Ligand binder design. Structure first.
Ligand SMILES: *[C@@H]1O[C@H](CO)[C@@H](O)[C@H](O)[C@H]1NC(C)=O
Ligand SMILES: [Ca+2]
Ligand SMILES: [Ca+2]
Ligand SMILES: [Ca+2]
Ligand code: NA
Ligand code: NA
Lengths: 276, 23, 23, 23
């Protein structure tokens, strides 16, 4: 694994021998591409470069097959041919046939590792918020009070952990009645004694979450989990479900999931305990 | 302006490889 | 003036190679 | 007028020579 290197034809800068087949394997570290450029090219010319040729192979396709004699157009650069590959590995193959009718001094080439800008070089940006490119890689960052997920791609608000054991309580989405945060997963847990059952009540006007898509799928959703039984997912302007839910369980999980865009007022509910 | 004419034909091919050995 | 013309066709076939070795 | 096109590619490789003598 190198950052730069040099590739010279056999016996350069003198003439190359006949019937030779030399190969070089070029490798730069991960997170880099390769800029390969020729500064000298003096090889026997033939149709399709069949006799003598220098070959460039990225992945396993052919980037190019060079032969003939060429000098640079610019006096500001000796580069005659150049290749830019988005891969970290490359192969160069030089071969010559049985005879040279003239003095052919072969070729001279150089390669340098080129940084990949993952934030711009691709169709999609691999970060929910801010993408930070550096040399040899990249990293994602988050706005204040947002934290990076284990996938190191998604940023989300910390709104999980609060366990409710009180027999009566109220629960609301973050910042209610101000808009809820985006790209977040909020988990609320209610734990009562055995003999009691969690019953959730809320007013219909106390629920405003982004509406479902054209296929009825909730992009933002609120769901109640009581073991195997399940209530939801709920979304839309106004609570579409029952305003009074007897969960038949002393333990209830409340999960509020939101995507990247489209936030609304949120929700506010009350729970209490009924006997079994 | 008026483009140049199609170039001349290339040089003749090089000598063939030496023949096979004899008996 | 005008832009460069196109390349010409290929040249004539090369001469036959030398005779083989012995053995 | 413009520059005449670059000369064409060189002719095909000559055929191999005849077989040789025998030491
Ligand atoms: C979020 O806040 C809670 C306190 O409410 C804390 O226990 C927890 O460690 C914080 N971070 C995460 C990832 O839950
Ligand atoms: Ca040759
Ligand atoms: Ca990078
Ligand atoms: Ca949303
Ligand atoms: Na050489
Ligand atoms: Na809210």
């Amino acid at each position: 694994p190198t950052m730069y290197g040099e590739i010279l034809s056999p016996n350069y800068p003198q003439a190359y021998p006949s019937e030779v087949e030399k190969s070089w394997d070029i490798e730069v570290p991960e997170g880099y591409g390769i800029h390969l450029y020729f500064t000298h090219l003096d090889i026997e010319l033939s149709e399709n470069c069949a006799y003598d040729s220098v070959q460039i192979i990225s992945g396993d396709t052919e980037e190019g097959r060079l032969c003939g004699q060429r000098s640079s157009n610019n006096p500001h650069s000796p580069i005659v041919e150049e290749f830019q590959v988005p891969y970290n590995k490359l192969q160069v193959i030089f071969k010559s046939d049985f005879s040279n009718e003239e003095r052919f001094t072969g070729f001279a080439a150089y390669y340098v590792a080129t940084d990949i800008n993952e934030c711009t070089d691709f169709v999609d940006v691999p970060c929910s918020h801010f993408c930070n490119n550096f040399i040899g890689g990249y990293f994602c960052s988050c706005p204040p009070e947002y934290f990076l997920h284990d996938d190191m791609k998604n940023c989300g608000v910390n709104c999980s952990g609060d366990v409710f054991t009180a027999l009566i309580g109220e629960i609301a989405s973050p910042n209610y009645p101000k808009p809820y945060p985006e790209n977040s997963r909020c988990e609320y847990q209610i734990r009562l004694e055995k003999g009691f059952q969690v019953v959730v009540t809320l007013r219909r006007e106390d629920f405003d979450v982004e509406a479902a898509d054209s296929a009825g799928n909730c992009l933002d959703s609120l769901v109640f989990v009581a073991g195997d039984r399940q209530f939801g997912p709920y979304c839309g302007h106004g609570f579409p479900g029952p305003l009074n839910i007897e969960t038949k369980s002393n333990a209830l999980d409340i999960i509020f999931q939101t995507d990247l865009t489209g936030q609304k007022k949120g929700w506010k509910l009350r729970y209490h305990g009924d006997p079994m | 302006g008026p483009p140049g004419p199609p170039g001349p034909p290339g040089p003749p091919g090089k000598l063939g490889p030496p023949g096979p050995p004899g008996p």
